[PDB]
From a paper:
To gain a better understanding based on their activity and stability, we determined the structures of N31, N55, and N134 via X-ray crystallography. The models for the remaining ancestors were predicted using AlphaFold 2.41 N31, N55, and N134 were crystallized with one, two, and three homodimers in the asymmetric unit at a resolution of 3.1, 1.6, and 2.5 Å, respectively. Also, the overall structures of the PADs were found to be conserved, leading to an RMSD below 1 Å if aligned to BsPAD. The C-terminal part (depicted in red) shows some structural and sequential diversity. N55 and N134 harbor an N-terminal loop (depicted in blue) absent in N31 and BsPAD that contributes to some extent to the dimerization (compare also Figure S4). All ancestors showed a highly conserved active site architecture with identical catalytic machinery. The residues corresponding to N132 and T41 in N55 originate from these helices. Both were found to form a hydrogen bond to the NH1 atom of the catalytically active arginine in all crystal structures.
Enzymatic decarboxylation of biobased hydroxycinnamic acids gives access to phenolic styrenes for adhesive production. To date, several PADs have been biochemically analyzed and structurally characterized. PADs adopt the lipocalin fold, and the core of the protein is formed by two mutually perpendicular β-sheets. In solution, a homodimer is formed by two monomers that are related by an improper 2-fold axis. In this study, we used ancestral sequence reconstruction to generate thermostable decarboxylases.
Residue numbers in the entry:
A (entry chain D), B (entry chain A): 24 to 192
Amino acid sequence: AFESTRPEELTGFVGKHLIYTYDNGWQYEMYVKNERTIDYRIHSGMVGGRWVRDQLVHIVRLSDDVYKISWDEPTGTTVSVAVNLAERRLHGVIFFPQWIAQDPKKTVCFQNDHLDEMRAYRDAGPTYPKLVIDEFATITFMEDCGADDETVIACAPSELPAGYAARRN
Amino acid sequence: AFESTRPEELTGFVGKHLIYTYDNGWQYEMYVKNERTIDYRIHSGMVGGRWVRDQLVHIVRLSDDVYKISWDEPTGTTVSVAVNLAERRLHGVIFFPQWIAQDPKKTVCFQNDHLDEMRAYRDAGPTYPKLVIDEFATITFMEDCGADDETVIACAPSELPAGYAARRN
């Protein structure tokens, strides 16, 4: 299931830590913690407040500048993001089960301690139709943190220092 | 929902028709028929035989060489494919509902003649867990067919001239 993960192709991407705002105004944050893991943190929008550690991901090189990250969520959400490092742009496709569209705050939590709850909401549905978000984002802040830094994403977005998510480079 | 579709950015990609083989040996074919539509045809693998016309897609430009096509299927399957034209490399992530994994032949048809049946199988489930296929592919054949050529993918894989899927360029 992870035969596609090729670490020699990902050396320019593993360790990236990016804060980005989709064109719909939703502000997100991702840490590429290693070849098959991300942590992430949502700052604003439909599921603002949500954060996730140790999300297993498929990370692949599409070009020297462009990397993709895809994954399955215990909520039933499926996601594929692409990051263009040279142009400081991200693109997301997110396929949300209809239950999340109807009551997105149900997913707003530190998900790692609510996995049965997410699977319960997911099992109850509705599943269909998916709410499909297909959106470009601007990468406002990007830095290299190296691999396996447990400190990058280790608190809820409400508990960060004033100005954290607004920092740019 | 199609805000991200920007035809002016896709002129180098719309019209492409590619045959590709994933790393697991499954041989696929896609025609980018216009800015928001693909036809596709599956030659081998778990759902060899299956073909689809007029699939609504989200097509975006990630770089001058890299494009992304993402979609939601009436079976509940969600997909995101990326194509690097310069490298003749494709990558796909496919999230199949569990019911397809259990009996994939149920989806092996000209789907457009079986839409109610696909919605019925999708609604009965099971949905979870997804079977997630994440794989590179070799683009073995690529050509430019222009937009809205209704002849590129219009018959089953078994109704093509001998050697069609084996052609190389």
